[PDB]
C-alpha cells in the first residue's frame, strides 16, 4: 500500500471555482478569428436579438451576474448599461432581450471552459462558425461551439 484513485481524480475531478455574484462577460471558447475574446453583445433595445462580436471593453460586451440557485447552478443575467431588463430565450431559438421577472441560464464549469444552458438542461448556447459580428444560436450540443466561459469586468 502506498497510493490510492478509487473515488478521486486530477485535472477533471479536481475543480476551485464555482463563481460568484458581480459584474462579467461571457464570450465563447472557440474565441474571434480576430484572434481575440468572442463576447456576448447587447443590440440596445428590447424584445430582440442577440449578437457576438470581438471584446473591446464597451458597455455593450459587460453584464450583471447573480445566483438564483446553486441547487440547479442557474443564474440571473442583465446588461450593465440597462440593469432595469434581462436576457432569455424565445421563438427561432436565439437569446432575446425581455422584461425584468425571473429569468435565468445553467453555467458549469468543466475540464477547461464553461457550459452554458435554458435551466431545464433541454438545450445549450452555441454559434454556427464562430465568426465576429454573428448571431449567436440555441439547441442541442454543438460539436465545436457548445463551450463557453464567464470571467470578471
Do not use: C
Given at each position: 500500500?502506498?497510493?490510492?484513485?478509487?473515488?478521486?481524480?486530477?485535472?477533471?475531478?479536481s475543480?476551485?471555482?464555482?463563481?460568484?455574484?458581480?459584474?462579467?462577460?461571457?464570450?465563447?471558447?472557440?474565441?474571434?478569428?480576430?484572434?481575440?475574446?468572442?463576447?456576448?453583445?447587447?443590440?440596445?433595445?428590447?424584445?430582440?436579438?442577440?449578437?457576438?462580436?470581438?471584446?473591446?471593453?464597451?458597455?455593450?460586451?459587460?453584464?450583471?451576474?447573480?445566483?438564483?440557485?446553486s441547487?440547479?447552478?442557474?443564474?440571473?443575467?442583465?446588461?450593465?448599461?440597462?440593469?432595469?431588463?434581462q436576457?432569455?430565450?424565445?421563438?427561432?431559438?436565439?437569446?432575446?432581450?425581455?422584461?425584468?421577472?425571473?429569468?435565468?441560464?445553467?453555467?458549469?464549469?468543466?475540464?477547461?471552459?464553461?457550459?452554458?444552458?435554458?435551466?431545464?438542461r433541454?438545450?445549450?448556447?452555441?454559434?454556427?462558425?464562430?465568426?465576429?459580428?454573428?448571431?449567436?444560436?440555441?439547441?442541442?450540443?454543438?460539436?465545436?461551439?457548445?463551450?463557453?466561459?464567464?470571467?470578471?469586468?
Amino acid at each position: 500500500m502506498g497510493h490510492h484513485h478509487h473515488h478521486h481524480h486530477h485535472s477533471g475531478d479536481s475543480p476551485a471555482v464555482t463563481l460568484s455574484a458581480g459584474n462579467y462577460i461571457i464570450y465563447n471558447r472557440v474565441l474571434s478569428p480576430r484572434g481575440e475574446k468572442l463576447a456576448l453583445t447587447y443590440p440596445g433595445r428590447q424584445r430582440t436579438p442577440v449578437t457576438v462580436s470581438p471584446l473591446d471593453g464597451s458597455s455593450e460586451q459587460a453584464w450583471i451576474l447573480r445566483s438564483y440557485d446553486s441547487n440547479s447552478n442557474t443564474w440571473t443575467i442583465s446588461p450593465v448599461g440597462s440593469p432595469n431588463s434581462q436576457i432569455g430565450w424565445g421563438a427561432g431559438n436565439v437569446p432575446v432581450v425581455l422584461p425584468p421577472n425571473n429569468y435565468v441560464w445553467t453555467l458549469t464549469l468543466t475540464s477547461g471552459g464553461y457550459n452554458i444552458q435554458d435551466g431545464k438542461r433541454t438545450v445549450s448556447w452555441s454559434l454556427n462558425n464562430a465568426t465576429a459580428g454573428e448571431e449567436v444560436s440555441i439547441g442541442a450540443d454543438a460539436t465545436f461551439s457548445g463551450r463557453w466561459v464567464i470571467e470578471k469586468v
